[PDB]
Design an enzyme around this catalytic site. Structure first.
Site, PDB file in Angstrom:
ATOM      1  N   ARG A  18      -7.821   2.926  -0.653  1.00  0.00           N
ATOM      2  CA  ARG A  18      -8.163   4.249  -1.182  1.00  0.00           C
ATOM      3  C   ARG A  18      -9.167   4.154  -2.330  1.00  0.00           C
ATOM      4  O   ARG A  18     -10.181   4.849  -2.297  1.00  0.00           O
ATOM      5  CB  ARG A  18      -6.877   4.963  -1.625  1.00  0.00           C
ATOM      6  CG  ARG A  18      -6.160   5.601  -0.426  1.00  0.00           C
ATOM      7  CD  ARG A  18      -4.718   5.995  -0.761  1.00  0.00           C
ATOM      8  NE  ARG A  18      -3.794   4.851  -0.677  1.00  0.00           N
ATOM      9  CZ  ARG A  18      -2.462   4.930  -0.665  1.00  0.00           C
ATOM     10  NH1 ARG A  18      -1.849   6.105  -0.829  1.00  0.00           N
ATOM     11  NH2 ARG A  18      -1.736   3.841  -0.465  1.00  0.00           N
ATOM     12  N   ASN A  36      -4.231   7.176   2.929  1.00  0.00           N
ATOM     13  CA  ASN A  36      -3.715   5.995   3.613  1.00  0.00           C
ATOM     14  C   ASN A  36      -2.344   6.370   4.162  1.00  0.00           C
ATOM     15  O   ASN A  36      -1.451   6.746   3.401  1.00  0.00           O
ATOM     16  CB  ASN A  36      -3.704   4.773   2.678  1.00  0.00           C
ATOM     17  CG  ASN A  36      -4.004   3.477   3.419  1.00  0.00           C
ATOM     18  OD1 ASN A  36      -3.893   3.419   4.641  1.00  0.00           O
ATOM     19  ND2 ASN A  36      -4.428   2.438   2.727  1.00  0.00           N
TER      20      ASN A  36
END
Length: 91
Positions: A18, A36
């Site tokens: 991320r 995610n």
């Protein structure tokens, strides 16, 4: 300008994926999001000029400095939603 959605799988979680995607969008001033997923995949939506957008996807194929991507998929839209910034999200 162009919009993509990207989906990624592999060793792609618990590595800062991320964060690395957020800065890889930021260094191109793309707009969009990254998450995610609990199912194990990364998901991304990104918007920008198609050359920078492709280069961002090329970077996502590597993943973090610690990733091992094993699959990646892309979808596109030739008109934007018009995101203001690029954001890590959890929805």
């Amino acid at each position: 300008m162009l919009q993509y959605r990207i989906i990624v799988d592999g060793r792609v979680q618990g590595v800062g994926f991320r964060y690395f995607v957020q800065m890889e969008a930021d260094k191109r001033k793309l707009a969009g999001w990254v998450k995610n997923r609990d199912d194990g995949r990364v998901e991304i939506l990104a918007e920008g000029p198609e050359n920078a957008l492709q280069s961002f996807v090329e970077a996502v194929k590597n993943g973090s400095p610690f990733s091992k991507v094993t699959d990646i998929s892309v979808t596109e839209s030739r008109s934007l939603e018009g995101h203001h910034r690029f954001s890590i999200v959890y929805s």
